[PDB]
Design a protein around this ligand. Structure first.
Ligand SMILES: COc1n[nH]c2ncc(C#Cc3c(F)ccc(NS(=O)(=O)c4cccc(Br)c4)c3F)cc12
Length: 291
């Protein structure tokens, strides 16, 4: 639990402009490192237990600021921004199957670490594309994995998050590690379609559809069966039927040995002008049904 002085940080944006949980890009002056700083109401000493987590696919802890009223957590800064912002930009047009496979494996490997390999078992509960960021060499890094335990006030809006939330999380039901499998499924769908899940729908409406109606995001008819089946396994209503992250990694490895899949997936990825209408038709249907 290395302490970093507030005076040892150069902030690049003003740090008084955000809600708790806001993250600011900063320079750690004494170490000449670019860092992220999350603003917190206060920091539990017990958060020490997460300070020892370390994996190439999770954001790296650096220290804590402990000078009331200024509290925060300092981590590495991933130079290329959030996965969400990348996906929903025109830059994601450069993604091919090898790109998606690498990034899907990155996130699955970080979550497997959190669930099974870390000194403390971590169930994220808030995994989403805005909580994954891209390092300078393209490695993805999961953020906010300690929020649900140690600074729940940062997480809650909640309406924004309902596309990524497992039904059992939405209902405050018994929750297992496979709530993160469901969320990961959504992140994979975002990478494949490069669309905002349930775009333009009210969050309460999403939660209702997902929980009571077993509604799930539209998988385009031309999506390769291997990806579609993986999405369906992640999205099972019964959380005990969802795959672990070890199983997901195994599936990804089997898909990477399928010599027919690069052509099928790249053709699907570059065919967005044709299948985008299948997603928009579902959204029109869902919006009209609410009316
Ligand atoms: C666009 O936003 C970003 N672009 N590039 C980025 N790189 C890093 C971040 C971040 C972060 C961050 C942070 F500054 C503090 C904490 C956390 N996550 S945490 O609260 O779950 C955490 C992580 C590790 C140890 C402990 Br203790 C707590 C974080 F994820 C955000 C970005």
């Amino acid at each position: 639990f290395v302490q970093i002085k507030f005076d040892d940080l150069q902030f690049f944006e003003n740090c008084g402009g955000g809600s708790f949980g806001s993250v600011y890009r900063a320079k750690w002056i004494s170490q000449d490192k670019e860092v992220a700083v999350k603003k917190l109401l206060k920091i539990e000493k017990e958060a020490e237990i997460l300070s020892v987590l370390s994996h190439r696919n999770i954001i790296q802890f650096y220290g804590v600021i402990l000078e009331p009223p200024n509290y925060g957590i300092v981590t590495e800064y991933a130079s290329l921004g959030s996965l969400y912002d990348y996906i929903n930009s025109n830059r994601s047009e450069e993604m091919d199957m090898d790109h998606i496979m690498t990034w899907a494996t990155d996130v699955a490997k970080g979550m497997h670490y959190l669930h099974m390999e870390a000194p403390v078992k971590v169930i994220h509960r808030d995994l989403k594309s805005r909580n994954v960021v891209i390092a300078a060499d393209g490695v993805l890094k999961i953020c906010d994995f300690g929020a649900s335990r140690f600074h729940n006030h940062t997480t809650h809006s909640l309406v924004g998050t309902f596309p990524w939330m497992a039904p059992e999380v939405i209902q405050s039901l018994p929750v297992s590690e496979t709530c993160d499998t469901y969320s990961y499924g959504v992140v994979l769908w975002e990478m494949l379609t490069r669309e905002v899940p349930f775009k333009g729908l009210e969050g309460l409406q999403v939660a209702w559809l997902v929980v009571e109606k077993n509604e799930r995001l539209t998988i385009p008819s031309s999506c390769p069966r291997s990806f579609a089946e993986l999405l369906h396994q992640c999205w099972e209503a019964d959380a005990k039927k969802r795959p672990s992250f070890k199983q997901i990694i195994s599936i990804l490895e089997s898909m990477s040995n399928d010599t027919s899949l690069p052509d099928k997936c790249n053709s699907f990825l570059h065919n967005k002008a044709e299948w985008r209408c299948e997603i928009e038709a579902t959204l029109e249907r869902l919006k009209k049904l609410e009316r």
